[PDB]
UniProtKB/Swiss-Prot annotation, chain A:
Gene3D superfamilies recorded: Aerolysin/Pertussis toxin (APT), N-terminal domain, Proaerolysin, chain A, domain 2, Proaerolysin, chain A, domain 3
Residue ranges crossing the lipid bilayer per the database entry: none
Residue segments, region Interaction with glycans from host GPI-anchor: 322-331
The protein, known as: Aerolysin
Entry's localization field: Secreted; Host cell membrane
SMART domains: Aerolysin
Outcome after substituting residue 366 to A: Nearly abolishes heptamerization
Organism, as annotated: Aeromonas hydrophila
Domain writeup: The C-terminal propeptide is required for normal protein folding and secretion; it maintains the aerolysin precursor in its soluble form and prevents premature heptamerization and pore formation.
Modification after translation (UniProt): Proteolytic cleavage and subsequent release of the propeptide trigger a major conformation change, leading to the formation of a heptameric pre-pore that then inserts into the host membrane.
Positions bearing the site annotation: Important for heptamerization: 350, 366
GO terms, molecular function: identical protein binding; toxin activity
Annotated S-S bridges: 18-74, 158-163
Swiss-Prot record, chain B:
Secreted listed as a keyword: yes
Subcellular location: Secreted; Host cell membrane
Keywords assigned: Disulfide bond, Host cell membrane, Host membrane, Membrane, Secreted, Signal, Toxin, Transmembrane, Transmembrane beta strand, Virulence
Domain writeup: The C-terminal propeptide is required for normal protein folding and secretion; it maintains the aerolysin precursor in its soluble form and prevents premature heptamerization and pore formation.
Region described as Interaction with host N-linked glycan: 44-60
Species for this entry: Aeromonas hydrophila
Name this protein carries in UniProt: Aerolysin
GO MF terms held by the record: identical protein binding; toxin activity
GO biological process per UniProt: symbiont-mediated cytolysis of host cell
Modification after translation: Proteolytic cleavage and subsequent release of the propeptide trigger a major conformation change, leading to the formation of a heptameric pre-pore that then inserts into the host membrane.
Subunit structure: Homodimer in solution; homoheptamer in the host membrane. After binding to GPI-anchored proteins in target membranes and proteolytic removal of the C-terminal propeptide, the protein assembles into a heptameric pre-pore complex. A further conformation change leads to insertion into the host membrane.
GO CC terms, sorted: extracellular region; host cell plasma membrane; membrane
């Protein structure tokens, strides 16, 4: 009887006060799911647990100690139990799209068999080839344009009511979305940052009043030349839901950002200039001067990358339903040639959600498609949780190629030892031509009052 | 203006009503930090935003659409601004502990400089060497204990009151904690699932349901792991985990917490399992039972990542002109302070704690972070503390290899014409010689589920 973190709910109604039909989480329970609770709190957040214990945000390392808080962590008084476990992702090696789909759809233990038992458990009939006594065995997997249709092999003759009527299981509408957080990289091949030039000069205090309260700002326009390779072809059908900057690797800063909904393969590189502005707030004593140095660099990186693209697809089960064993909510006995489709992946609507239909299986007005509590009493809760955990298992594909970028940047503005004015104003020269040629454009040194 | 997900807060006070000094987040702000809001929400949770909009739990895909809710995501009307960035981790290849400490502490751009500058902004004196006029230059790094010390070179002579008293930055108390979720492996060198035997039988009935055929047995794994270098006798995990699944050769290895990675290189672990089915045996009929037993061994090169954390002790005297010590001691005292760069230990040692709680006078008892900002300007201090606090992690690599004996599911077949009788042959002596110990089949009735 485990505490399920997705059912925790946090209320702001004072000490140990939880909403209605909710009760406070205790220390032993917060302990068994600490990583989960803390990961759902603000950095320096502090929320209450039962009996005067508190759990602190991640910035405090998620410590649980005696305390009091105005907001509490609450757990249902009537939790929904038996959640579908969530197994580890099934990683399929990169390749062109039919090799990736192909590899998935022919996997007996991780696909063919688990989806067959599903069509079987829900009441569909003849879910297996006629050269076997077990479900999901001896199945012919054929192509169907964009889709794949797995259907029991019919070679020969069968015996049973409409036994020559095998349930078809068809896979379609495949989509691949890249998870930017999945970034990883092989050995950094090319790598280095050459100091191409170092600008030095002075900042002078021609006054009897010491100066402070002025910022010395530097601004340049540098370019970033980057390029990337796509080893296989899936690359052309995969996309990102929302843009992201290419990850920092090395010390070498770069500003490259990938676009959403535009195929990975179409984004292979380019040159992009940027406007950067370095700055310092010096303090030069009266009738004195301080030295200012600025180190300019060129850098480059080369390394093999790898991101993961999750796969989702529509799963249609079509065939007639059994007599005296059907999971549909109305429970037909007339053997209707039923046709239903679940979406394995991100949510779309309630009808195609096993998880949604399964977690709501007790709100009477919710059960309008399949009768999940029916399947449970027929088969048993574990049987069903292991069946749905495998059919719902996360499937990810590797996306790879090579990465290479090159850029020029300036370190910060560094000041020296104030020295007695010789026998704020800047005496630091810039040769716009030489820097344009070193890859630095529009470089300017401004002086502005602090604020 | 920037929204900071660490300042979001959720209230449950009716529709669009936030707690005091807080205001509802609007669809255009929630959108920008979606990933974070959603990550903070229950599976099918729905939370309100500003102007009749709503954000849906991760189960509904985290979608923001017009709606209404009696719980709201609020943000401060008064937000702490200028948070210190967070850069991506800095990776140090595997080597011996002294090599991994060396690669960190000697890096000028990523360590001698940011750290020297921190000491310099806090008012510490003579944070450079006699051969240079800039901060963090001409410094010496030297072994001392199982820690090191950075301090300006004192050869030559100098200019300045007590200028021969350089500030020393001492790094020690290194710790390395392994992060399980960093698992990665090379080319899997060996993989193969072979069918050893298949117990077959007949669930016999002379219908009958509410019965569960239960198969209880013993799995077994043999493994070994190597450890390319030595850091490994120092790396540990705060939590015990379960070695990752790769391939489809089921394993059952548990890496214990608080032990050197190198004192856990292999073994043999048995673990009993229960397989169960609920048959619906027609009257006077026989249903077939099949159980496949297998053998597989996997073996590949691995690599995990350990978070390196250490203590930073600044020792030297504070300047009269101005230091950041909250009481601004004008008598140039000898100052000693140490920050813990890693998991939070206490407020005195947390730059971030102190920095994020800088506007709350009650809290300012160590360094005055508002003073440094005024003195040097806000983007300088936050770009400096981001390099001082940038996560650093070392790789732990080596070769792994395992073999196990697991059993597929007990599958039933179509029932054929003929207290539930189970005709299923099992010679425990044979299964034992084959590697399966304690195999047995049973029938117990059903009352729940």
């Amino acid at each position: 009887e485990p505490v399920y973190p997705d059912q925790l709910r946090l209320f702001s109604l004072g000490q140990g006060v939880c909403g209605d039909k909710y009760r406070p989480v205790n220390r032993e329970e917060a302990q068994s799911v600490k990583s989960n609770i803390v990961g759902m709190m603000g950095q320096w957040q502090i929320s209450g647990l039962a009996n005067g214990w508190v759990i602190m945000g991640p910035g405090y390392n998620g410590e649980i100690k005696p305390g009091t808080a105005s907001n509490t962590w609450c757990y249902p008084t009537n939790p929904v139990t038996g959640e579908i476990p969530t197994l580890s992702a099934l990683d399929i090696p990169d390749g062109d799209e039919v090799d990736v789909q192909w590899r998935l759809v022919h996997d007996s233990a991780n696909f063919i068999k688990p989806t067959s038992y599903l069509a079987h458990y829900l009441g569909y009939a003849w879910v297996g080839g006629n050269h076997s006594q077990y479900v999901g065995e001896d199945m012919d997997v054929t192509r169907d344009g964009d889709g794949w249709v797995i259907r029991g092999n019919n070679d020969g003759g069968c015996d049973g009511y409409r036994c020559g009527d095998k349930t078809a299981i068809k896979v379609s509408n495949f989509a691949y979305n890249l998870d930017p957080d999945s970034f990883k990289h092989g050995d950094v091949t090319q790598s280095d940052r050459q100091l191409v030039k170092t600008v030095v000069g002075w900042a002078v205090n021609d006054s009897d009043t010491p100066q402070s309260g002025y910022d010395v700002t530097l601004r340049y326009d540098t370019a970033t030349n980057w390029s990337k390779t796509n080893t296989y072809g899936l690359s052309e059908k995969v996309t990102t839901k929302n843009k992201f900057k290419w990850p920092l690797v090395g010390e070498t800063e770069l500003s490259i950002e990938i676009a959403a909904n535009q195929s990975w393969a179409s984004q292979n590189g380019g040159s992009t200039t940027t406007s950067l502005s370095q700055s310092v707030r010096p303090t030069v004593p009266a009738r004195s001067k301080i030295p200012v140095k600025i180190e300019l660099y060129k850098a480059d990186i080369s390394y093999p990358y790898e991101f993961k693209a999750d796969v989702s697809y529509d799963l249609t089960l079509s065939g007639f339903l059994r007599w005296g064993g059907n999971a549909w909510y109305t429970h037909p006995d007339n053997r209707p040639n039923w046709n239903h489709t679940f979406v394995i992946g991100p949510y779309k609507d309630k009808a195609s959600s096993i998880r949604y239909q399964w977690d709501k299986r007790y709100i009477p007005g919710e059960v309008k498609w399949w009768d999940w509590n029916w399947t449970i009493q027929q088969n048993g809760l574990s049987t069903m949780q292991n069946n749905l955990a495998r059919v719902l298992r996360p499937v990810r594909a590797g996306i790879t190629g090579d990465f290479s970028a090159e850029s020029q940047f300036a370190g910060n503005i560094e000041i020296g030892a104030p020295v007695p004015l010789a026998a704020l104003r800047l005496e630091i020269p810039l040769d716009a031509q030489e820097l344009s040629g070193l890859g630095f454009n529009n470089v300017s040194l401004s002086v502005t009052p602090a604020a």
